Amino acid sequence: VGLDQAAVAKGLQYFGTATDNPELTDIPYVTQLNNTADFGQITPGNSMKWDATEPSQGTFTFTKGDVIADLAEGNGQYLRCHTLVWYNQLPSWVTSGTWTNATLTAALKNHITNVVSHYKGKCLHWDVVNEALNDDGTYRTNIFYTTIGEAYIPIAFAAAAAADPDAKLFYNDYNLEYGGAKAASARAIVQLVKNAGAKIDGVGLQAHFSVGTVPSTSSLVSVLQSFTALGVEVAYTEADVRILLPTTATTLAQQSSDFQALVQSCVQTTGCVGFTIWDWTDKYSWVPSTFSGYGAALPWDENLVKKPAYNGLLAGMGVTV
Ligand SMILES: *[C@@H]1[C@H](O)[C@@H](O)[C@H](O[C@@H]2OC[C@@H](O)[C@H](O)[C@H]2O)C[C@H]1O
Ligand SMILES: *[C@@H]1O[C@H](CO)[C@@H](O)[C@H](O)[C@H]1NC(C)=O
Ligand SMILES: *[C@@H]1O[C@H](CO)[C@@H](O)[C@H](O)[C@H]1NC(C)=O
Ligand SMILES: [K+]
Numbered sequence: 271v272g273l274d275q276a277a278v279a280k281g282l283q284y285f286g287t288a289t290d291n292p293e294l295t296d297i298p299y300v301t302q303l304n305n306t307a308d309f310g311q312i313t314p315g316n317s318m319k320w321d322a323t324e325p326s327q328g329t330f331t332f333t334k335g336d337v338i339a340d341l342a343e344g345n346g347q348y349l350r351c352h353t354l355v356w357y358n359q360l361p362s363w364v365t366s367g368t369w370t371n372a373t374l375t376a377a378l379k380n381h382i383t384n385v386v387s388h389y390k391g392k393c394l395h396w397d398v399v400n401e402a403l404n405d406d407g408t409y410r411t412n413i414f415y416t417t418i419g420e421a422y423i424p425i426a427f428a429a430a431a432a433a434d435p436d437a438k439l440f441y442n443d444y445n446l447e448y449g450g451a452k453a454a455s456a457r458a459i460v461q462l463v464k465n466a467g468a469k470i471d472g473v474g475l476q477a478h479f480s481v482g483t484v485p486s487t488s489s490l491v492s493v494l495q496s497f498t499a500l501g502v503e504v505a506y507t508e509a510d511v512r513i514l515l516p517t518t519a520t521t522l523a524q525q526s527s528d529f530q531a532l533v534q535s536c537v538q539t540t541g542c543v544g545f546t547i548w549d550w551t552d553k554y555s556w557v558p559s560t561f562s563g564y565g566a567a568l569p570w571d572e573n574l575v576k577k578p579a580y581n582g583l584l585a586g587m588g589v590t591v
Contacts, residue, residue, distance in 0.1 A: 272307030273580075276587035277545065280537045282288055283346050283394075284544040285583075288508070291334050293554050294341075297330040298574055302550070304345055311394070313505025313507075314338040316558075318351055319359040322467055323385050326364050327377065339392055350507070350546065353442065354382050355426045356400035357412035361553040365413055374417045379429045386433035397442040397474060398430045399423050399459075399505070405445065423459060423580030424466035431469035442474035447485070449493050460500050473497045474507035477532055478548075480564070481513050481521050484528040489579035490535030498541035506536060510567035511579070514556045517566050526582030529569065533586035544575050 273285040287309050295336045303309065316322060317334035324330055342349045355378070367374070381569055386396065402423060404410050412514040414422035423441075430439050441460065446453045456473060463470040475494070484490075497504050511528045513521045549555055553572040569579040581591040 271584070271589055273583055273587070274310035275307055276584055276589050277533075278310070280587050282536065282542075282544050284311035284546075285309065286313065286348065286350070286546045286552045287545065288313040288315045288548050289548065290315035290549075290554070291317055291337055291339065293549075294337065297524060299553070299555035301553070302570075302574060303341075306345055306347065309345075309347060309550070311350060311544060312338065312342040312345075313350045313352050314481070315352075315549070316359070318385070319353060319356070319387075320364065320381065321359045321361045324381055325361055328380070330388070332388055335389075339389065343392070348390075348394040349392055350395045350397070351386075351389055352416065352436070353400040354385065354430060355398065355414060355422070357410060358401075360413070367413070369413070369417045371418055373480055374458075375422075375425060378414065378418070378422065378425060382429035383433050383539060386430050386437070386456060390434045390529070391436055393434065394438045395438045395440050395472060395474075395505070396430055396434075398426050398439050400442045401444070402441070402459060403443055403452055403455050405452060414449040420462065421466075424463045424468040427463050427468040427470055430465070438471035438503065439469055440472035440474045440507075441470065442476065444476040444478050444508070446475050447479075447490060449496070453493060453496065457496065457500065460497070460502060470502060472503045472505065474505055477506040477509035479511050479528060480561075481511050481524050481528060484511070484531055486525075487531045487534045487538070490531060490540050492544055494535060494539040497498065498539060502541075504536075504539065504542045505544045505546070506532060506542075507546050510548045510555065510557060512561055512564040512567040514563055515565050521568075522578045525566075526578040529579045530586040532583040533583050537587060
């Protein structure tokens with residue numbers, strides 16, 4: 271059995287992966303991306319972000335995003351559409367604009383309406399608002415927060431829901447798995463959106479970790495339940511477990527136990543619907559270009575061969591390997 275077959279057998283909707291357009295000329299890569307025994311879901315890594323979809327005010331370009339959407343439909347894989355509102359990968363007409371609350375609110379609603387309407391009925395989920403919090407649970411500064419204030423959040427959710435009523439709408443963030451101040455602030459964002467009368471369906475827990483910093487399965491379950499108690503679904507959205515290079519048999523074994531605890535916590539939680547890894551092979555991992563000296567974060571190595579973590583994920587979904 272593959273990862274998605276194992277997930278569906280334990281009542282998850284999917285096991286899936288991110289990818290990106292430049293990777294699709296690598297035929298051995300795409301042959302395994304197309305393996306629906308392992309992958310039942312796809313996330314576009316870059317080509318549905320604001321800089322990729324609205325490069326000048328009022329001009330939309332969907333060619334690259336459409337390539338990823340058509341591959342998912344071609345395979346019968348779910349699509350998580352990613353992402354509408356984020357501090358990172360904005361075009362300079364947004365970051366450098368002369369704005370008022372009124373003019374940036376209109377331009378934000380226009381962006382969301384055009385992009386969500388283009389993909390209407392194709393998106394199982396949208397990551398509507400991404401990374402709105404500092405490490406201490408205060409709001410992250412960005413042009414939306416300094417010009418519109420915290421209202422930018424329910425405005426984005428209400429604009430996405432009017433353009434595609436069938437998409438589940440997620441708030442997505444990292445380091446929520448530790449609970450404490452940041453998780454409490456992500457619960458408060460869920461309550462902000464409900465208080466405003468706007469639709470929110472989900473919280474995405476990105477599940478970025480350094481090897482050996484993942485807590486017990488029962489700890490993870492308690493944090494996931496703190497969100498499902500609000501009446502939202504949860505999912506792990508950008509999972510990777512990074513190693514300070516070079517790897518050893520010890521750190522590859524700890525990486526396997528770490529991925530095993532994360533997927534078991536999702537199996538055990540009612541309302542946790544699925545698991546996405548941030549690409550599937552060390553060959554194309556974002557980690558080395560972001561976390562200096564770290565790498566080998568994924569369940570397949572740079573030769574596209576399975577690592578110990580592949581069997582750890584199967585063990586966390588109750589398969590003997
Ligand atoms: C989670 C975030 O939501 C996601 O968009 C990030 O993807 C990376 O964004 C930066 C870009 O240069 C990389 O190619 C892409 O993988 C990863 C994480 O921050
Ligand atoms: C992968 O699947 C997509 C969609 O079905 C298809 O366009 C593509 O040609 C496939 N590629 C390979 C190498 O199997
Ligand atoms: C912007 O406008 C909306 C709607 O009137 C409001 O909720 C928000 O508080 C305003 N923000 C600022 C900082 O002026
Ligand atoms: K579950």
